[PDB]
């Protein structure tokens, strides 16, 4: 599908509210496998199961290993911009 830019607002006591799978070491993008109900990703409205996370706050995630992506994603605070695509 088309590449989308999506804004997520997270409070500091929260996680993102997603499960991710995949990573470069598996030859698969960082993929959203779960959107947890009521948590920030669900609330933002624009992130969905099956979306590949291409970048977050300008950090490319296309070639990142799984754990690299976890570190990068979990670092982000407040108003967080995602670049995603549903394939």
């Amino acid at each position: 599908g088309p590449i989308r830019k999506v804004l997520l607002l997270k409070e500091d006591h929260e996680g993102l509210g997603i499960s991710i799978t995949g990573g470069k070491e598996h030859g698969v993008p960082i993929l959203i496998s779960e959107i947890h109900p009521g948590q920030p990703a669900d609330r933002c409205g624009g992130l969905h199961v099956g979306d590949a996370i291409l970048a977050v706050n300008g950090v490319n995630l296309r070639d990142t290993k799984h754990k690299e992506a976890v570190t990068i994603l979990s670092q982000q605070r407040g108003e967080i911009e995602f670049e995603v695509v549903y394939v």
Partner: peptide, 9 residues
């Protein structure tokens, strides 16, 4: 199990 590892974040 997921096809590949999964992390909740």
């Amino acid at each position: 199990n997921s096809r590949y590892p999964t992390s909740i974040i």
